[PDB]
Homo-oligomer: A and B are copies of this chain.
Amino acid sequence: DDRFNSSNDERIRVTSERVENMSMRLEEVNEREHSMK
C-alpha cells in the first residue's frame, strides 16, 4: 500500500478532482461575497 500510494499515478488523479472541487467552492464563495457586499 505504501508503494502504491507514493507513485505519481495516484498523486495526479486525486489532485485533479481536488482542483475542480476547490474551483466550484471558490465560485460559490464569490457569489456569497458579492451578496454580502
A22-B21 in contact (CB<8A): no
- The listed residue (B13, B16, B18, B30) touching A29 by CB distance below 8 A is B30
Residue of B nearest to A11 (CB): B16
- Output the least CB separation between A9 and chain B (Å): 7
Kindly identify which residue among B9, B23, B36 contacts A18, using a CB–CB cutoff of 8 Å.
B23
Would A18 and B19 count as touching, CB distance under 8 A? yes
Measured CB to CB, the closest approach of chain B to A23, in angstroms, equals 5
Cβ contact within 8 Å between A8 and B11 = no
Q: In this complex, what residue of B is CB-closest to A20?
A: B18
| Contact call A12/B8, Cβ cutoff below 8 A | yes
Given contact pairs A22-B26, A25-B30, A29-B29, A14 touches B15 in the complex (Cβ within 8 A): no
